């Protein structure tokens, strides 16, 4: 922990020098000249171990690493070299580890507005790996966020930023971290739901995540995508254009198939989504009747899982109360 103490001192000294240069507005500090990259690299590596994290937190390590990330982004923006990219990656990983399950760390980082804007800005980085790193931070920050944190996460545009990011990512690891953060953020409030739905191509994209073929034998993408979809389905139900996007990307059939998943998360997400979409739309009700939704949902009403039991029963009630004309023996 003498070592950790020395690394954090180097970082704080460098930041002070940066803040001094900013306040003057004596050449512009460059991270390479103070060997910042090895310093953060080492702290990042230590941060995977829980006992080292506790040592790091005694030294205000989260605050110092965040301050470094912020001042580099401010100084060099996204018109920056690989040393700076590397630095932000290793810083971001440390912040991910340090915010995991830590009430105080999450609240501190979300109160750092400048640092928050800087994180969001990195979702446009040329390093897609850096994007994944930032989305991992935002994922943790958005889990069990207090009132002030939720407000800041919204006000710095994290949701639109993450949704836009998702549309351009080429790699599954990036998509996983980006969707996981969106899933958490989509639960915070109604404006977040609206902002997700307002991004052009987002609904079609989320529908596509419902049948993602993970080459790592995992359900993470389908879970987070279906989770986002379930959280925004309340608003989608009010908008006929948005319902139509879902229809023409085969959302309804896929959701029925989700009802049979071994993942309770997938079944719960599907029940929640079907609950909302089965409300007040004759044509979606009719489509769901035609695909045998009624018996499918009836099979879940006695679930142990409270959201599957209430969602399945609510969707079933919407269908049972609106038996289509053609079903009435006929006519």
């Amino acid at each position: 922990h003498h070592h950790m103490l020395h690394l954090l001192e180097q970082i704080r000294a460098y930041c002070e020098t940066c803040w001094e240069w900013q306040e003057a507005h004596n050449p512009m500090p460059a991270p390479v000249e103070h060997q910042i990259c090895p310093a953060v690299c080492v702290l990042m590596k230590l941060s995977f171990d829980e006992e080292h994290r506790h040592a790091m937190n005694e030294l205000g390590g989260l605050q110092a690493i965040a301050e470094l990330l912020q001042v580099d982004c401010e100084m060099y923006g996204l018109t920056n070299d690989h040393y700076s990219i590397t630095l932000r990656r290793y810083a971001g990983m440390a912040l991910t580890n340090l915010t995991f399950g830590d009430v105080a760390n999450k609240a501190t980082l979300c109160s750092m507005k400048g640092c928050m804007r800087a994180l969001v800005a990195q979702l446009k980085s040329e390093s897609e790996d850096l994007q994944q790193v930032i989305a991992s931070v935002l994922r943790n920050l958005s889990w069990r966020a207090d009132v002030n944190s939720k407000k800041t996460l919204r006000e710095v545009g994290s949701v639109k930023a993450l949704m836009e990011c998702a549309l351009e990512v080429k790699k599954e690891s990036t998509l996983k971290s980006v969707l996981s953060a969106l899933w958490n953020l989509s639960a915070h409030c109604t404006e977040n739901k609206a902002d997700i739905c307002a991004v052009d191509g987002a609904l079609a994209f989320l529908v596509g995540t419902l049948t993602y073929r993970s080459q790592t034998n995992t359900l993470a993408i389908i879970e987070s995508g279906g989770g986002i979809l379930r959280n925004v389905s309340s608003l989608i139900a009010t908008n006929e254009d948005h319902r139509q996007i879902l229809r023409e990307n085969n959302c309804l059939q896929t959701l029925l198939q989700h009802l049979k998943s071994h993942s309770l998360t997938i079944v719960s997400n599907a029940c929640g989504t079907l609950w909302n979409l089965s409300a007040r739309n004759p044509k979606d009700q009719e489509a769901l009747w035609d695909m045998g939704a009624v018996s499918m949902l009836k099979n879940l009403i006695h679930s142990k899982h409270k959201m599957i039991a209430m969602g399945s029963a609510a969707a079933l009630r919407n269908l049972m109360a609106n038996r289509p004309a053609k079903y009435k023996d006929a006519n």
Binding site: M93, T96, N97, S136, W143, R144, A181, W183, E223, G227
Partner: peptide
């Protein structure tokens, strides 16, 4: 989604 250490 929950939260996680960096992966």
């Amino acid at each position: 989604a929950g939260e996680a250490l960096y992966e």
